[PDB]
Write a structure and sequence with these properties.
This is part of a larger assembly, with five copies of chain A. The first copy, chain A, has 50 residues and is mainly alpha-helical. Helices cover 86% and strands 0% of the residues of chain A. In chain A, helix 1 packs across helix 2. The two termini of chain A are 24 Å apart. Chains in contact: A-B, A-C, A-D, B-E, C-D. Chain C: Belongs to the resistance-nodulation-cell division (RND) (TC 2.A.6) family.
Chain lengths: 50, 50, 91, 50, 49
C-alpha cells in the first residue's frame, strides 16, 4: 500500500528540479541548458533536501 | 557542489542509479511475501490431565 | 522562497509572500496532484482487500486536497504574521 | 542537462489548453493571497473556526 | 525401477543437502561482472571501455 502512495511522493522531488529548469530556460534565452541545471540546483536544493 | 559533480558526469550518475535498481530487483526476488506483518499475539498452550 | 526574498533578495514582508506564491504555485500543485492521482485508484479499487484500500484512499485524498487548496492560501499569511512579529522583536 | 533543449515547441492542443487554465489559476491564487494578506484578522479567525 | 511400488527413496547427509539445495547464485557470477562493468564505466566515464 505504501508503494502506491509512494508513486506520487517519489516524483515530487524530481518535479521540483525539472519544473525550475524549464522556467529558467524559458525566462532566459541565453542560459545554456547545463548552466540551467547548476543554477536550478542552487535554488531548489534546500526545497528538496528539506 | 555535490550536485554539479553529477551534472558534469552524466555517466557516473546513471551508473549509481543502475546499481540501486539492480540491488532492488535482487532484493525483491529474495524477499518473502506475506499478507500482513506478524500482528498475532504469540501463544503457548499448557495442558494438564486430571 | 519567501524567506530568501525577505533575507537576501531584498523584498518587503508583504511582497515576498505574494511573489513567493506566484513562483512556487506551479511546483506545489504539480506535486500535490501527482500524489492525489497516485492515491485515486485506491478509493476506486474493487476486489479482494478493497475495504482497506478504500479507507486509506479517502483519508489521504481529502487531506492532500486541503493541503493543496486551502493551506497554500493560508501559509503565506502565517509567514507574514510570524515574520512581522520577528521584526517587532528585533526593534 | 543532457537531453532537455529549448528548441522544443508545439505541445499538443489538449495539453496547451490545460496549461493555460493552470496559468490563470496562478493569478487567482496570487490575487487570493493578496486579499488574505490584507485581511490579517478575519482570516486568522477562520483558522480557529476550522 | 526395482522398489517403486512400496519403497520410498529417501536421502541423508550430504545427499539430502544436495537434492534439496535448489541453490541460487548461478546468476550471481554474472551479476558480479555486471557490477564490475558499471563501477568501471563510471571511473572511465565511458560505457565502451
Amino acid at each position: 500500500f505504501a508503494l502506491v502512495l509512494a508513486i506520487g511522493i517519489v516524483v515530487d522531488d524530481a518535479i521540483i528540479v525539472v519544473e525550475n529548469i524549464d522556467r529558467i530556460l524559458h525566462e532566459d534565452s541565453n542560459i545554456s541548458v547545463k548552466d540551467a541545471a547548476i543554477k536550478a540546483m542552487n535554488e531548489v536544493s534546500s526545497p528538496v533536501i528539506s | 557542489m555535490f550536485s554539479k559533480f553529477f551534472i558534469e558526469r552524466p555517466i557516473f550518475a546513471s551508473v549509481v542509479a543502475i546499481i540501486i535498481s539492480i540491488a532492488g530487483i535482487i532484493g525483491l526476488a529474495n524477499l518473502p511475501v506475506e499478507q500482513y506483518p506478524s500482528l498475532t499475539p504469540p501463544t503457548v498452550q499448557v495442558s494438564a490431565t486430571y | 522562497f519567501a524567506m530568501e526574498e525577505r533575507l537576501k533578495k531584498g523584498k518587503s514582508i508583504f511582497e515576498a509572500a505574494i511573489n513567493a506564491a506566484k513562483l512556487r504555485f506551479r511546483p506545489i500543485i504539480m506535486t500535490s496532484l501527482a500524489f492525489t492521482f497516485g492515491v485515486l485508484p485506491m478509493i476506486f479499487a474493487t476486489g479482494a482487500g478493497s475495504a482497506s484500500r478504500h479507507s486509506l484512499g479517502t483519508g489521504l485524498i481529502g487531506g492532500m486536497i486541503a493541503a493543496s487548496t486551502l493551506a497554500i492560501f493560508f501559509v503565506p499569511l502565517f509567514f507574514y504574521l510570524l515574520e512581522n512579529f520577528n521584526e517587532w522583536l528585533d526593534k | 542537462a543532457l537531453f532537455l533543449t529549448r528548441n522544443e515547441s508545439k505541445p499538443f492542443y489538449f495539453i496547451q489548453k490545460f496549461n493555460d487554465f493552470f496559468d490563470w489559476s496562478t493569478s487567482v491564487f496570487s490575487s487570493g493571497v493578496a486579499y488574505i494578506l490584507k485581511r490579517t484578522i478575519r482570516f486568522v479567525l477562520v483558522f480557529c473556526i476550522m | 525401477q526395482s522398489l517403486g511400488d512400496e519403497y520410498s527413496i529417501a536421502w541423508s547427509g550430504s545427499a539430502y543437502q544436495e537434492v534439496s539445495s535448489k541453490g541460487a547464485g548461478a546468476y550471481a557470477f554474472v551479476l558480479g561482472m555486471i557490477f564490475v562493468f558499471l563501477i568501471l564505466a563510471a571511473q572511465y566515464e565511458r560505457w565502451l571501455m
